[PDB]
């Protein structure tokens, strides 16, 4: 398709500034590192405690 | 220390709740909140910003009689994958532990700012609350929250009402 | 009966994180460091289109297999795309020497 | 769990002592308040006291006339009504407040 | 302070019929509201302690809902035991606590 | 803060020692101890559980005329070895620093629970110890340790015995 | 807590400033300073000492028809470079955060040593300072700084001068 | 911002009360001192008091004779000069000290 | 304590001329020094609050410098407004504060 990317994998182009991806081991471009993880969530906020 | 958070407090992460003859409600401590935000925002950006990938091409093609090389290439990809996965998981867990303690520290420091400022003009009751011995109207509450409270001004009323 | 309480914000967020000591901790705000989305399309890299050979492989395209004649020619390619179903090249049976090296050189 | 005494009635300009005693509650960890129901009217909040005794609130309609004191050792709450008006004839109730004072205060025990 | 009013002064439905009451505030409450049911000659009983969250000892017949200024009590099936005067309080802003006038629910 | 640990205290990591007219000895503060254990146990497991090796085969064989490849393979193994060794050493040292501070924090928090609960009914003496001004028998010691101590109950005796 | 540092204090990282009838000036708290130094020095050395490189040779040469291998070699170098760069940046930032908090902790602990030692014989004023109610000459200042101050000795003078 | 009264002069062996009042300063967050300028001489520091009133210093030349007291509620500083000598005839000034007491103390307001 | 002296008892230059004053201490001060300019009949005015750092409200005409025991005041261009008695204080060691005798600057 007529679209632009910076990183491309066989499943489709990836458009992100994040350091890791779990989409595919093989890429072309300035890509995030492939990880086996399903979740890398970094807390920024407060422990959330309604009561 | 403190049992839980507040939902009426929607103008910042840290703050005060008050009740006095003239009204009640919640307000953020803006200096505390903004500093916590800037610190954390910068932390998140650092984790992301520090990685700098070069333009690359990962896949390689090998033929019928190049199996040892193909397996070498796999060895390289697997090694890098384990390193990045392991480090990424630990980095996130370590940063999350500290972010949450950071926030708890800031709440305690906010508490101490007030405790030190009020001294004997208020009873320390617990769970983050103080009670004034003297009448403390909206002007008073703002000076306590703002770090501008005049202790001597109310010390006579406060000690008289103590016993 | 004038009082003052010190506390912190709560929210309706269901986003949880793990920490070193604890698991499934709900937080008011969080950021995702892991990208799990793709657009399902093959895009240009740095503004340049891929060479899409469709049903042909590189040997077909370079040698001129009769079935690769319909492929267009781009003056520049960012990467080369072949389908998994591709099966047109070396139609007269034989070896293509250093085929993998040629494929690597032509990728861009 | 709570026994109430309304003080009976007097003519306007007089005064009354009202009193409640609680046996089903600690009365040291809970605040208390008075609510007044005039016949034919809605339910009016009148006054509040914390368990520390340092914190008291009154409705504007009774300021300067009504006052609260309590004695935690006796599990008792006292309300003194001075300078009574015809408008103050009502049923007075003692209500035990919620434990979670700074946030949700919903008057769960009457 | 926050002025609470209740528009449906009389709610009258047949036995077993679904019925509701509304409460309106002059200022945002943000669910810091409570509902009471008062039988004649009795102190009012707390039925819902939050704007919507049910009080201990209260049957499933009652539940509430609400937003910033508008709140609702739902009676899923009015029982012979339920004719009563209902009230809303608020505790969002309370040097004094305040209540609305209250409304009556009756059975046909 | 505290000079050293106790050996008679064998029922948990954190706890109390007491002496009163009716007896003496050590007992663990079970809530504190169990929470510390669960936190740490989970920490250790996380360090181990997060690594997930794929089935592999490390060794490779190269011949007489493939020295450049053999040396490439060595380069790969050495690179991975240095990364894992360095990261493993630092991870352990960093985690150990925090585990020990974590434990010290919990001891201080236990101390504060008691200090806040006792207020003026006991003299704070130091090295983790308090002395009651009023008689404090086994029932009293349990209520202090359990967070259920009634301050007002003994305040008259305690102030009379203060001077 | 404390607004800034001192420049006249040139004999150590942590210390005291005093003024009394007989003189004034700055002096380091040597036990605190030396322990902080040894801790930190060891920390720095650990970061450096733990890495142990084997004798190697990084460059490799490939010919006209070995492009896939040359690109494999590049892949390996780039992978290692990103890992080391990323880990090195984060390690330094994480260690710096802790070094600075470590130092702040030590300052507070120094403060508490004195506050606990002086009790009611000095007014706590703020920004790291105390004022003695009783006359406190050079001998006194040294005993406070050294942890050898005799509270009872001056308690009569101090309470008389309090009101 | 500061008004000074030198107390006028008396003969040796007598005494004088000196006093200053400040209106441009809080006089609760600042320390104060007295400086004496004898005619024909250099500038001599004489005495100092902190705002807590717990801290006072005197020049050796006036010890046992001069004393300082202050009242923060009146914004006033008092100096009592006893057992006066001929050498004590001088112009006395009240000087507001720097805010940064433990470090840089440079007498910025006269 | 620290004894301060000032050697250039009289500094006399023509209008607009550059001129300097020196201060000397018996003990190291380490820049914990201040300079004053006193007009006849007036309390002295603070001109430099640190050994070298200029006080608020003071013109660029004045600046200082110094080290452990030796300090200097520089007047870049003496004005008709500047004949005055100048003094150094110290605050490095001060149960008492101390001052030097002071010197006079005059215009030819
Ligand atoms: C891709 O980038 C080029 C500039 O290099 C720009 O002209 C073109 O419009 C972009 N394509 C799309 C689909 O945005
Ligand atoms: C990539 O995502 C950003 C938002 O994170 C968006 O602004 C940008 O337009 C996207 N790029 C493309 C090529 O769609
Ligand atoms: C709070 O501080 C600001 C300056 O940042 C000041 O303008 C405001 O008047 C202060 N408020 C009170 C109650 O003193
Ligand atoms: C929180 O409530 C708001 C409405 O006030 C809603 O828009 C938002 O989606 C809710 N968030 C979550 C996580 O439920
Ligand atoms: C966290 O929640 C998910 C459901 O979202 C559940 O599958 C998982 O087991 C939970 N983990 C823990 C430690 O409770
Ligand atoms: C300690 O708490 C438990 C409840 O967890 C209670 O059963 C026990 O009686 C309490 N002990 C004391 C001394 O109050
Ligand atoms: C300080 O402690 C040392 C022992 O380490 C002792 O020799 C010295 O006399 C003590 N100083 C004071 C003022 O007590």
Author numbering:
A (entry chain A): 275 to 325
B (entry chain B), F (entry chain G), G (entry chain I): 9 to 171
C (entry chain A): 10 to 55, 55A, 56 to 83, 83A, 84 to 92, 92A, 93 to 114
D (entry chain H), H (entry chain P): 3 to 52, 52A, 53 to 82, 82A, 82B, 82C, 83 to 100, 100A, ...
E (entry chain L), I (entry chain R): 1 to 95, 95A, 96 to 107
Task: Show me the paper's own sentences about this structure.
Antibodies to the major surface glycoprotein haemagglutinin (HA) are critical for providing protection against influenza virus infection. Here we report a distinct class of broadly neutralizing antibodies that target a discrete membrane-proximal anchor epitope of the haemagglutinin stalk domain. Anchor epitope-targeting antibodies are broadly neutralizing across H1 viruses and can cross-react with H2 and H5 viruses that are a pandemic threat. Antibodies that target this anchor epitope utilize a highly restricted repertoire, which encodes two public binding motifs that make extensive contacts with conserved residues in the fusion peptide.
To investigate the binding motif of anchor-targeting mAbs, we generated a high-resolution (3.38 Å) cryo-electron microscopy (cryo-EM) structure of 222-1C06 bound to A/California/7/2009 HA. The broad paratope of 222-1C06 made extensive contacts across the HA fusion peptide19, which mediates viral membrane fusion with the host membrane. Binding of the fusion peptide was largely mediated by an NWP motif within the K-CDR3, a Y58 directly following the H-CDR2, and a W99 in the H-CDR3, with these HA-binding motifs acting independently and in combination via an aromatic pocket. Crucially, molecular dynamic and cryo-EM analyses revealed numerous intra-Fab interactions of hydrophobic and aromatic amino acids, including p-stacking of K-CDR3-P95 with K-CDR3-W94 and H-CDR2-Y58 that rigidified the paratope. Moreover, both the K-CDR3 NWP and the H-CDR2 Y58 were found in all the anchor-binding mAbs and were germline encoded, which could have led to the selection of B cells utilizing these variable genes. Broad analysis of human, swine and avian H1 viruses revealed that the side-chain contacts of 222-1C06 were highly conserved (94–100% conserved). The five side-chain contacts of this broad epitope were also highly conserved across group 1 viruses, with the W343 contact being 100% conserved across all group 1 viruses. All three mAbs bound an epitope near the anchor of the HA stalk and were oriented at an upward angle towards the epitope, suggesting that this epitope may be partially obstructed by the lipid membrane and may only be exposed for antibody binding as the HA trimers flex on the membrane. Moreover, H1 viruses possess a highly conserved glycosylation site on the HA stalk that lies above the anchor epitope, which may obstruct antibodies from targeting this epitope from above. However, vaccine HA antigens must have a native-like conformation near the transmembrane domain, as trimer splaying potentially due to the GCN4 trimerization domain ablates antibody binding to the anchor epitope.
